[PDB]
Amino acid sequence: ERDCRVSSFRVKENFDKARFAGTWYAMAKKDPEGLFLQDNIVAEFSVDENGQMSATAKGRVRLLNNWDVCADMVGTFTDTEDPAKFKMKYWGVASFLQKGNDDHWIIDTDYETFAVQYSCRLLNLDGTCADSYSFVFARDPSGFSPEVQKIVRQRQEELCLARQYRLIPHNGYCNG
């Protein structure tokens, strides 16, 4: 019944870039193929005078060679016809870190407690997502109330990603 085509997923109505600014702690994540960013992920979003949103993030990355490293990442966002859907250009301070461009959609947020983000990197021929990623963020590192958890589970189902997220630990690895 419920549809899994990317094009039918709802996004945050009248998304407010200025109210979304600030620190966000990743509480859970659904990984894409060839995952990057393992844990200890914290993002800081900013909006300039002209309305251009940007963000920085820190997180542990397991190098293919088994070294663990703390990645310092940067992303700039371009607005689209949908205030909640952006195109994100990203790179790291260290040249060996992943660089690219991915869609960045704000599925839902209350601005003060939680946010649900989603990106589909590759579309299947049917319109469904063949490779996606999603982060659940919180304003407080302690988490969300049960009432918010209820809303998050629902959005997760709506993205056809129910049961596919893992909890993200924070142990100060990248200084936290």
Side-chain angles (χ1 to χ4, degrees):
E1 191 268 297
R2 300 269 88 176
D3 188 350
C4 297
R5 311 164 278 184
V6 178
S7 66
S8 61
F9 285 169
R10 304 269 41 142
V11 301
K12 178 76 189 179
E13 52 289 342
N14 308 303
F15 180 68
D16 194 323
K17 285 172 291 190
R19 280 170 76 22
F20 195 80
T23 308
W24 283 105
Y25 296 83
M27 201 243 154
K29 186 201 173 204
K30 203 299 286 201
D31 307 10
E33 305 301 350
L35 97 103
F36 188 70
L37 305 197
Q38 297 255 75
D39 57 28
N40 284 272
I41 304 151
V42 189
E44 182 88 22
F45 280 76
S46 310
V47 64
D48 67 17
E49 212 81 294
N50 195 187
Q52 322 170 47
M53 186 167 83
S54 62
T56 51
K58 227 148 117 86
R60 185 175 57 100
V61 185
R62 253 273 159 86
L63 247 289
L64 205 274
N65 75 338
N66 244 62
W67 297 154
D68 258 345
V69 299
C70 277
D72 293 288
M73 310 294 297
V74 193
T76 48
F77 298 89
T78 292
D79 298 59
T80 73
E81 279 94 262
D82 191 302
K85 297 181 176 183
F86 293 92
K87 270 54 276 181
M88 178 184 80
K89 190 166 88 188
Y90 66 95
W91 66 92
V93 311
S95 64
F96 57 79
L97 297 172
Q98 188 172 291
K99 320 170 181 195
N101 248 106
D102 282 341
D103 276 358
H104 186 98
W105 289 9
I106 304 303
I107 297 311
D108 196 17
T109 183
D110 68 352
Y111 307 99
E112 311 189 305
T113 317
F114 77 99
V116 181
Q117 172 270 353
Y118 172 83
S119 313
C120 175
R121 303 234 263 208
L122 180 74
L123 244 43
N124 269 309
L125 281 341
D126 58 7
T128 59
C129 193
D131 180 32
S132 60
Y133 70 92
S134 179
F135 279 85
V136 170
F137 291 107
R139 240 70 236 226
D140 196 303
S142 301
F144 313 134
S145 61
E147 285 81 9
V148 4
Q149 289 180 16
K150 181 250 105 173
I151 289 154
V152 173
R153 41 126 262 223
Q154 183 177 317
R155 302 301 185 233
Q156 290 180 154
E157 195 70 61
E158 305 180 337
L159 297 167
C160 300
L161 291 182
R163 287 159 233 120
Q164 291 184 231
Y165 292 76
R166 282 172 3 92
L167 261 19
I168 290 177
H170 292 270
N171 53 35
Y173 192 88
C174 296
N175 279 176

